[PDB]
Amino acid sequence: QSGQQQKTTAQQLLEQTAYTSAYSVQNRLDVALFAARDLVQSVISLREAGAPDRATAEQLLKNALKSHPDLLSMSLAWEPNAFDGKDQQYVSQPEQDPKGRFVRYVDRDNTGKVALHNLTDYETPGSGDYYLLPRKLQKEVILEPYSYPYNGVDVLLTSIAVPIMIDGKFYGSVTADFSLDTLQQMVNGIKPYQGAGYATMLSASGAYIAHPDKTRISKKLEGDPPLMDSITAGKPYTRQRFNSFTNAEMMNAYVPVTIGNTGTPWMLGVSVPEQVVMAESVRL
Numbered sequence: 001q002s003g004q005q006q007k008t009t010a011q012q013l014l015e016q017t018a019y020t021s022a023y024s025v026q027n028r029l030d031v032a033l034f035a036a037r038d039l040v041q042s043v044i045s046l047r048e049a050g051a052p053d054r055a056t057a058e059q060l061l062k063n064a065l066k067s068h069p070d071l072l073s074m075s076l077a078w079e080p081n082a083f084d085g086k087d088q089q090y091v092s093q094p095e096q097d098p099k100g101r102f103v104r105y106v107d108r109d110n111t112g113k114v115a116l117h118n119l120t121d122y123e124t125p126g127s128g129d130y131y132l133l134p135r136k137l138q139k140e141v142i143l144e145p146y147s148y149p150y151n152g153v154d155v156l157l158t159s160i161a162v163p164i165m166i167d168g169k170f171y172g173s174v175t176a177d178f179s180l181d182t183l184q185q186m187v188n189g190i191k192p193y194q195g196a197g198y199a200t201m202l203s204a205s206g207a208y209i210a211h212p213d214k215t216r217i218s219k220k221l222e223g224d225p226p227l228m229d230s231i232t233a234g235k236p237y238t239r240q241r242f243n244s245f246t247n248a249e250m251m252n253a254y255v256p257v258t259i260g261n262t263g264t265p266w267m268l269g270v271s272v273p274e275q276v277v278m279a280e281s282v283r284l
């Protein structure tokens, strides 16, 4: 084999590892996507049956989180009068939204018990983007990392939001949420080539989601136009070069992570020395 044939064979093997690594992340993320889609369908059916009960929708929301231990939280939020048409009945009741909106989320307490809460920032620009973005865009959305308090501490999280669309109109939205600690666990555990390489993940905006350097989490990618352009376009990207700083021939292969119908894929990378991939091409 010529030097270009050997490069291609290692590059093909690496690209296959990056592809199956990206799919493993997609499978874990799909737990949130499917939970949110399934709850949306369930509450559309509940509403279609007429005179829907908030307590039943709350139970469906609690059950959805209980079924998925890896999820941080889930939320269910409706437009004014869009669930039961009865918001005004709740204004004077304790511990309701000030205008009686049906706006709830669930998390777990320190015993693992699912707990129900009111959403309070769902129309606040910034913190409320988990609701404001699917309302504006009227499609599935994956949010850039943001923090919110759970059990007295700030947790850095992402949300996959699925709008409640009926006849092409927006009635509300559901999220299923992951902590970034959970996402780092998933990526840091890939351990490509039995730990001889490492995996990284970036958001659609180029923020680090997972990286061996935990000081980078949620910071933006800098000084890599080809990679950033690939993330923006949702295209795979492979590169190989001799790193004169580390004195190793290094390979990098990036594969988009598809998230439902958001159209805004994240990006999984595998970084590994060429020698490691060549040795695996032999062990074949």
Ligand SMILES: C[N+](C)(C)CCO
Binding pocket: 073, 074, 075, 105, 130, 148, 159, 175, 177
């Ligand atoms: C994190 N919030 C609870 C504020 C919204 C997503 O569930």
